[PDB]
Amino acid sequence: QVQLQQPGAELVKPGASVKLSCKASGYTFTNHWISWVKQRPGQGLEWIGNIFPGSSSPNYNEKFKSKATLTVDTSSSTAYMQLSSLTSDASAVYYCTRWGNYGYYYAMDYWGQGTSVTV
Amino acid sequence: QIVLTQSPAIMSASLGEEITLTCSASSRVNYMHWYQQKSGTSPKLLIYSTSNLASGVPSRFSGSGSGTFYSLTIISVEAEDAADYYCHQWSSYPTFGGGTKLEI
Amino acid sequence: AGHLEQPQISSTKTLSKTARLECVVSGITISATSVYWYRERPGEVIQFLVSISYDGTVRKESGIPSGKFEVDRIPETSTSTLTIHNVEKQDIATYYCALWEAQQELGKKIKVFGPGTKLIITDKQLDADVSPKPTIFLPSIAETKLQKAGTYLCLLEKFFPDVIKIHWQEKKSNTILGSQEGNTMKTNDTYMKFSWLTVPEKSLDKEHRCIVRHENNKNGVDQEIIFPPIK
Amino acid sequence: AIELVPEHQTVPVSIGVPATLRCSMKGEAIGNYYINWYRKTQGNTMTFIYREKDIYGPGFKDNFQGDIDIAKNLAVLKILAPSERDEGSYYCACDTLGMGGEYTDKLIFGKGTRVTVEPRSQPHTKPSVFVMKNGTNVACLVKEFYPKDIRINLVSSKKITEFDPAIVISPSGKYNAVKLGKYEDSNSVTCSVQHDNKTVHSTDFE
Ligand SMILES: *[C@@H]1O[C@H](CO)[C@@H](O)[C@H](O)[C@H]1NC(C)=O
Numbered sequence: 001q002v003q004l005q006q007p008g009a010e011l012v013k014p015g016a017s018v019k020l021s022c023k024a025s026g027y028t029f030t031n032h033w034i035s036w037v038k039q040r041p042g043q044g045l046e047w048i049g050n051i052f053p054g055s056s057s058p059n060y061n062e063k064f065k066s067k068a069t070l071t072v073d074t075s076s077s078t079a080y081m082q083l084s085s086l087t088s089d090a091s092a093v094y095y096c097t098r099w100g101n102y103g104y105y106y107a108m109d110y111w112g113q114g115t116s117v118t119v
Numbered sequence: 120q121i122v123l124t125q126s127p128a129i130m131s132a133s134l135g136e137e138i139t140l141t142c143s144a145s146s147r148v149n150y151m152h153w154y155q156q157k158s159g160t161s162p163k164l165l166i167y168s169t170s171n172l173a174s175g176v177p178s179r180f181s182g183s184g185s186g187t188f189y190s191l192t193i194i195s196v197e198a199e200d201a202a203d204y205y206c207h208q209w210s211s212y213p214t215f216g217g218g219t220k221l222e223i
Numbered sequence: 224a225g226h227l228e229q230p231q232i233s234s235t236k237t238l239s240k241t242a243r244l245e246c247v248v249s250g251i252t253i254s255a256t257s258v259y260w261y262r263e264r265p266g267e268v269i270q271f272l273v274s275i276s277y278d279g280t281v282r283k284e285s286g287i288p289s290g291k292f293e294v295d296r297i298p299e300t301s302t303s304t305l306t307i308h309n310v311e312k313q314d315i316a317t318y319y320c321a322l323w324e325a326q327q328e329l330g331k332k333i334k335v336f337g338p339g340t341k342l343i344i345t346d347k348q349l350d351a352d353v354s355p356k357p358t359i360f361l362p363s364i365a366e367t368k369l370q371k372a373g374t375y376l377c378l379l380e381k382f383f384p385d386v387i388k389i390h391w392q393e394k395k396s397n398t399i400l401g402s403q404e405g406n407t408m409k410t411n412d413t414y415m416k417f418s419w420l421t422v423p424e425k426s427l428d429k430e431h432r433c434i435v436r437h438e439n440n441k442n443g444v445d446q447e448i449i450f451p452p453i454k
Numbered sequence: 455a456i457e458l459v460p461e462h463q464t465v466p467v468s469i470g471v472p473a474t475l476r477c478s479m480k481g482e483a484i485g486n487y488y489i490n491w492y493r494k495t496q497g498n499t500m501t502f503i504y505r506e507k508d509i510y511g512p513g514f515k516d517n518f519q520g521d522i523d524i525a526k527n528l529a530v531l532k533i534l535a536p537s538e539r540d541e542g543s544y545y546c547a548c549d550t551l552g553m554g555g556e557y558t559d560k561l562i563f564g565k566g567t568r569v570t571v572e573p574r575s576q577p578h579t580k581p582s583v584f585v586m587k588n589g590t591n592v593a594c595l596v597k598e599f600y601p602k603d604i605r606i607n608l609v610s611s612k613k614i615t616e617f618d619p620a621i622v623i624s625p626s627g628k629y630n631a632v633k634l635g636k637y638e639d640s641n642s643v644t645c646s647v648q649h650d651n652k653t654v655h656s657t658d659f660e
């Protein structure tokens with residue numbers, strides 16, 4: 001039983017910035033990776049980036065490196081995402097996932113409910 | 120870098136017959152994972168690490184694959200099984216499949 | 224305290240042909256203890272391959288069909304040699320040799336591993352100037368005089384096997400120097416690589432050379448290119 | 455058979471904070487066997503770290519620490535101070551101790567954990583770009599920059615092939631870089647490297 005709380009939805013103006021926050025609970029936050037996945041209507045899933053807790057310069061996708069910035073706070077036990085310089089087509093659903101490690105071999109076993117962001 | 124292609128995009132399977140969902144790769148991948156996303160719900164994990172079965176999943180969901188070609192099998196098709204299925208793998212960074220719709 | 228040493232850091236051979244891998248025990252005769260071999264296929268864990276003991280029994284594991292990679296030991300030169308028969312794509316892997324050494328304390332032993340060989344199999348290689356081609360880069364004017372430190376660049380190119388070993392050490396001292404390098408990039412036909420070294424004032428008044436270890440070097444010896452001393 | 459599965463296939467650690475690594479023993483019992491640890495910092499150079507009972511390698515007693523737990527049935531290796539030299543992939547090995555009629559004493563390994571290191575935060579510093587060449591090949595040397603981001607170009611660059619610069623970490627914590635280019639003409643020319651805001655030139659700095 002692991003929970004990955006994530007807000008409902010957000011609506012922002014074009015050219016603005018959005019901060020999406022995913023809060024983890026239950027499991028040990030330090031051990032497991034966290035990834036952010038973007039989903040659209042009529043889509044093929046894309047991976048934006050991932051971040052190990054207590055780390056710097058997390059890995060980013062080549063199509064989201066300039067627009068996405070992932071940070072974590074061990075004290076807050078939350079994972080944050082920042083999206084900037086948005087466009088018309090950057091309206092989708094963004095999920096936060098937890099990577100199982102021992103025998104799962106980095107499978108996103110627990111998922112967030114997702115945030116629907118439209119502009 | 121591995122390209123995961125799922126064909127066909129939309130596949131029709133009548134209720135009651137066991138059918139296999141297939142995920143193909145451009146290169147060799149060690150372990151592959153399968154996700155089920157129903158209508159208006161976040162994706163779930165069914166089969167983790169090439170046919171190991173995730174907790175809370177009915178035992179009739181099993182996978183089969185090796186090398187490059189991987190597949191997922193359902194023993195019994197039910198009404199509740201309508202969803203969209205993706206295949207995921209880790210090769211120093213994730214790579215999701217196209218996604219196939221399962222309908223009754 | 225003898226450390227295993229394998230003269231070849233890479234091995235390229237024609238497909239479906241015999242390949243021979245050897246590792247020599249430094250300064251110590253093997254005597255009673257046995258010599259082991261391991262294999263690391265890409266994207267896989269290393270697994271024990273063969274073992275030869277003082278009696279002479281050649282141990283193996285599951286699978287490992289007989290008549291493949293016979294292992295032989297030479298007490299005359301303290302050399303254990305493994306030769307692969309009918310090398311193939313699945314045979315493409317990395318090979319290590321190990322042996323248990325007994326500590327001075329009773330009942331404790333440590334398994335020491337060789338540097339590895341990284342067996343490589345490819346298409347019909349051509350021997351036209353596959354040796355690395357170097358290029359000396361002299362430090363620029365008003366750089367060492369004003370920074371009190373020196374920088375070199377050992378440019379290298381046109382070597383076919385994937386792995387190459389480059390390290391820097393001054394002519395008068397055998398110990399190696401802490402060097403920094405950039406990974407190789409794919410070129411038209413082969414690879415290229417450059418490494419730069421920083422030398423303090425104490426090593427400034429010395430003549431440096433760039434040591435490159437490669438399987439396809441001329442005459443099977445490490446290539447040497449001399450950097451004139453800063454002095 | 456016996457399987458050892460490492461906890462993470464990759465885990466970044468920073469300089470100065472201790473870290474732990476665990477290899478899981480999906481087998482009969484962790485207590486019966488002997489657990490080793492190996493490091494491959496170089497391309498293929500294996501480096502023994504810790505055999506089961508308080509016998510380390512050369513110079514690894516101070517830096518590293520090993521321990522075995524029974525209830526969780528794992529094998530824990532603790533790094534007390536990560537560093538650039540400590541950056542490497544670590545392997546967990548299982549000693550079979552032999553059986554009643556088995557004396558091969560082989561090692562059963564697990565997959566490596568690519569442990570990458572990242573420097574501690576320090577104030578930003580200017581890179582002293584130095585152009586240097588020999589013939590038609592030129593490689594300007596930006597030497598002492600801390601930030602990771604960098605934008606590059608070569609003035610009057612007519613080279614057929616462009617080479618990606620290499621970013622490395624100096625022992626002083628400030629990254630080093632080299633950008634190289636071979637020109638078929640106009641070899642005699644300097645290099646310009648823009649870092650942080652605006653531009654930095656090898657000209658008028660030489
Ligand atoms: C390799 O091929 C590329 C593209 O065809 C070319 O630009 C380059 O000059 C070639 N390298 C040679 C001829 O050494």
Ligand SMILES: *[C@@H]1O[C@H](CO)[C@@H](O)[C@H](O)[C@H]1NC(C)=O
Nearest residue numbers: 605648649650651652653654
């Ligand atoms: C810093 O960069 C901005 C644009 O990125 C520019 O407007 C500004 O003038 C720069 N600062 C200085 C001191 O030049």
